[PDB]
Amino acid sequence: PNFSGNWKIIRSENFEELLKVLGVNVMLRKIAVAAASKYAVEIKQEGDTFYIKVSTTVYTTEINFKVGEEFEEQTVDGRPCKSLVKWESENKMVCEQKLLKGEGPKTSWTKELTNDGELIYTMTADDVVCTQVFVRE
Protein backbone atom coordinates (compact mmCIF):
# COMPACT_ATOMS: atom_id res chain seq x y z
CA PRO A 1 0.00 0.00 0.00
CA ASN A 2 0.93 3.63 0.24
CA PHE A 3 0.05 5.84 3.16
CA SER A 4 1.31 9.00 1.40
CA GLY A 5 -1.20 11.79 1.02
CA ASN A 6 -3.00 14.63 2.72
CA TRP A 7 -5.58 13.25 5.14
CA LYS A 8 -8.55 15.12 6.62
CA ILE A 9 -10.43 13.88 9.68
CA ILE A 10 -14.02 12.63 9.50
CA ARG A 11 -14.48 10.95 12.92
CA SER A 12 -12.85 11.17 16.34
CA GLU A 13 -14.09 8.87 19.11
CA ASN A 14 -13.26 8.25 22.77
CA PHE A 15 -10.64 11.01 22.89
CA GLU A 16 -11.87 12.54 26.16
CA GLU A 17 -11.81 9.11 27.78
CA LEU A 18 -8.18 8.72 26.70
CA LEU A 19 -7.13 12.12 28.09
CA LYS A 20 -8.90 11.29 31.36
CA VAL A 21 -6.60 8.28 31.86
CA LEU A 22 -3.62 10.64 31.51
CA GLY A 23 -4.91 13.03 34.20
CA VAL A 24 -6.12 15.92 32.03
CA ASN A 25 -8.75 17.99 33.84
CA VAL A 26 -12.17 18.33 32.24
CA MET A 27 -11.88 21.84 30.77
CA LEU A 28 -8.62 21.10 28.97
CA ARG A 29 -10.15 17.80 27.84
CA LYS A 30 -13.11 19.52 26.18
CA ILE A 31 -10.84 22.03 24.44
CA ALA A 32 -8.53 19.22 23.35
CA VAL A 33 -11.47 17.27 21.92
CA ALA A 34 -12.45 20.34 19.91
CA ALA A 35 -8.89 20.65 18.65
CA ALA A 36 -8.78 16.95 17.71
CA SER A 37 -12.00 17.30 15.74
CA LYS A 38 -10.19 19.60 13.31
CA TYR A 39 -6.82 18.13 12.70
CA ALA A 40 -5.00 16.97 9.58
CA VAL A 41 -2.32 14.42 8.74
CA GLU A 42 0.26 14.64 5.96
CA ILE A 43 2.24 11.47 5.18
CA LYS A 44 5.21 10.86 2.88
CA GLN A 45 6.06 7.15 2.75
CA GLU A 46 9.12 5.79 0.92
CA GLY A 47 9.29 2.04 1.46
CA ASP A 48 9.61 1.54 5.24
CA THR A 49 10.49 5.21 5.91
CA PHE A 50 7.72 7.58 7.03
CA TYR A 51 7.49 11.35 7.39
CA ILE A 52 4.29 12.35 9.17
CA LYS A 53 3.10 15.89 9.93
CA VAL A 54 0.08 16.28 12.20
CA SER A 55 -1.48 19.67 12.73
CA THR A 56 -4.38 21.38 14.42
CA THR A 57 -5.34 25.08 14.28
CA VAL A 58 -2.48 26.40 16.42
CA TYR A 59 -0.01 23.47 16.67
CA THR A 60 1.93 21.23 14.30
CA THR A 61 4.38 18.38 14.92
CA GLU A 62 6.55 16.19 12.66
CA ILE A 63 7.22 12.50 13.27
CA ASN A 64 10.02 10.77 11.35
CA PHE A 65 10.73 7.06 11.58
CA LYS A 66 11.78 3.86 9.87
CA VAL A 67 9.83 0.68 10.59
CA GLY A 68 11.82 -1.47 13.01
CA GLU A 69 14.16 1.35 14.11
CA GLU A 70 13.73 3.06 17.47
CA PHE A 71 13.05 6.81 17.47
CA GLU A 72 12.01 9.48 19.95
CA GLU A 73 8.68 11.30 20.03
CA GLN A 74 6.26 12.39 22.76
CA THR A 75 3.37 10.51 24.29
CA VAL A 76 -0.19 11.61 23.52
CA ASP A 77 -0.14 13.89 26.55
CA GLY A 78 3.35 15.27 25.86
CA ARG A 79 5.94 13.23 27.66
CA PRO A 80 9.08 12.21 25.75
CA CYS A 81 9.28 8.54 24.86
CA LYS A 82 11.13 5.91 22.88
CA SER A 83 9.00 4.40 20.11
CA LEU A 84 9.25 1.40 17.79
CA VAL A 85 6.90 0.76 14.84
CA LYS A 86 6.25 -2.72 13.42
CA TRP A 87 3.96 -4.02 10.69
CA GLU A 88 1.00 -6.11 11.78
CA SER A 89 -0.20 -6.78 8.19
CA GLU A 90 0.17 -5.36 4.69
CA ASN A 91 -1.69 -2.15 5.56
CA LYS A 92 -1.47 -1.73 9.35
CA MET A 93 1.38 -0.74 11.67
CA VAL A 94 1.64 -0.69 15.48
CA CYS A 95 3.85 1.57 17.59
CA GLU A 96 4.88 0.66 21.13
CA GLN A 97 6.09 3.45 23.41
CA LYS A 98 8.29 3.50 26.51
CA LEU A 99 8.72 6.56 28.73
CA LEU A 100 12.19 8.09 28.91
CA LYS A 101 11.62 9.05 32.56
CA GLY A 102 9.14 8.24 35.31
CA GLU A 103 6.11 6.03 34.90
CA GLY A 104 2.64 6.32 33.40
CA PRO A 105 0.01 4.29 31.57
CA LYS A 106 1.02 1.93 28.80
CA THR A 107 0.57 3.91 25.59
CA SER A 108 0.76 2.93 21.93
CA TRP A 109 -0.72 3.86 18.56
CA THR A 110 -1.69 2.20 15.28
CA LYS A 111 -2.21 3.38 11.71
CA GLU A 112 -4.16 1.44 9.08
CA LEU A 113 -5.03 1.97 5.41
CA THR A 114 -8.39 0.31 4.74
CA ASN A 115 -9.61 -1.21 1.47
CA ASP A 116 -12.15 1.64 1.15
CA GLY A 117 -9.43 4.31 1.16
CA GLU A 118 -9.76 5.43 4.77
CA LEU A 119 -6.90 6.06 7.19
CA ILE A 120 -7.63 4.76 10.69
CA TYR A 121 -5.45 5.99 13.55
CA THR A 122 -5.80 4.63 17.06
CA MET A 123 -4.22 5.75 20.30
CA THR A 124 -4.36 3.52 23.36
CA ALA A 125 -3.77 4.16 27.05
CA ASP A 126 -4.34 1.04 29.20
CA ASP A 127 -7.86 -0.24 28.38
CA VAL A 128 -8.93 2.96 26.61
CA VAL A 129 -8.63 3.19 22.82
CA CYS A 130 -9.31 6.42 20.91
CA THR A 131 -10.13 5.92 17.23
CA GLN A 132 -9.87 8.56 14.49
CA VAL A 133 -10.80 8.14 10.81
CA PHE A 134 -9.49 10.22 7.88
CA VAL A 135 -10.12 10.49 4.14
CA ARG A 136 -7.82 11.82 1.44
CA GLU A 137 -8.21 15.53 0.80
CATH number of the domain residue 98 falls in = 2.40.128.20
Q: CA distances (Å), 54 to each of 7, 25, 121, in order?
A: 10, 23, 12
Q: Please answer whether residues 61 and 78 qualify as being in contact, where contact means their C-beta atoms are separated by less than 8 angstroms.
A: no
Q: Which residues neighbour 25 within 8 Å (Cβ) at sequence distance 6 or greater? A: none
- Experimental technique for the deposited model: X-ray
Domain assignment of residue 41, given as a range: 1-137
Model resolution, angstroms: 1.8
Q: Please answer whether residues 20 and 28 qualify as being in contact, where contact means their C-beta atoms are separated by less than 8 angstroms.
A: no
Question: How close are the terminal C-alpha atoms of the chain, in Å?
Answer: 18
Structural domains in the chain (count): 1
Q: H helices of 8-127, where?
A: 15-21, 26-36
Q: H helices of the chain, where?
A: 15-21, 26-36
Q: What one-character DSSP code corresponds to residue 25? A: -
Say how far apart CA 69 and CA 52 lie, in whole Å.
Answer: 16
Upper half-sphere CA count for residue 84 (Cβ side, 13 Å): 5
**Angle formed at CA 71 by CA 137 and CA 73, multiple of 5 degrees:** 60
The two beta strands, 107-113 and 118-125, are: antiparallel
Q: What one-character DSSP code corresponds to residue 34? A: H
Say how far apart CA 117 and CA 70 lie, in whole Å.
Answer: 28
Say how far apart CA 47 and CA 20 lie, in whole Å.
Answer: 36
